[PDB]
Amino acid sequence: GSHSMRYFFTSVSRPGRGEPRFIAVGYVDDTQFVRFDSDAASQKMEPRAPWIEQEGPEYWDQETRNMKAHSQTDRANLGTLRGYYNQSEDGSHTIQIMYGCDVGPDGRFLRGYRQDAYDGKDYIALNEDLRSWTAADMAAQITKRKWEAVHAAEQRRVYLEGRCVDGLRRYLENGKETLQRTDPPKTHMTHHPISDHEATLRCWALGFYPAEITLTWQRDGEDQTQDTELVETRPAGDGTFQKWAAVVVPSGEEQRYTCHVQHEGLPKPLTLRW
């Protein structure tokens, strides 16, 4: 299928405390493969998937140098934004950055992203044209003027269409055994009486990869929803994911209900009947 690489960066100022806390993670699809954590002993870019360990020491020295550099630039930007907004030095503030690229089944660039947030809200973002910026407020307009003057969009475009794609393509090859697999969901269905007259029917999807999935309860073929309790998709902790959908049904009619499961690891969607 198609594939994606994403890096997520969080800097949190802790005033009177140490330097800002900085955590960086990288993913290919829903698989984490690197991390950098300034509160960890390592002070280096560390592997989090096995297929990245075959990268040589020059890779780990470049990614580590770049992560430290990202940390430093965030530290400075924290002070800059504090000045733009006239916020006091005593409060803790957060910069978050996401960027990365998508390729299709042919390995060609399909989408690229770079977005920056301050205190949990959009700050500035590269547009899908990879040439212009959206500034979320008055302060980000200051940054937008600077980045227009310094040709930042072209530099980001070069990275997104270039080294981002090159690395993603390599990681997909070096980790094809895992990154390019799908694990289909294993579905359970469980019965939970609420009274003599009602019962919950819970449809489970377990051990599935990648995380995107759709669970629907249907009564006589008709997609319930409205009264279908759905929980957020959640990590099992082994690289697979879980989810369940629950529907309260009148006692006696459970056999009319069916659970519908759509997932990319399934050749056809499933309909399971109670």
């Binding site: 890096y7 960086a24 770049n66 550099a69 965030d74 600077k146 310094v150 930042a152 981002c164």
Partner: peptide
């Protein structure tokens, strides 16, 4: 592979 945060393009 991460991007570079060392140019004027990274400064707010």
């Amino acid at each position: 592979e991460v991007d570079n945060a060392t140019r004027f393009a990274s400064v707010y």
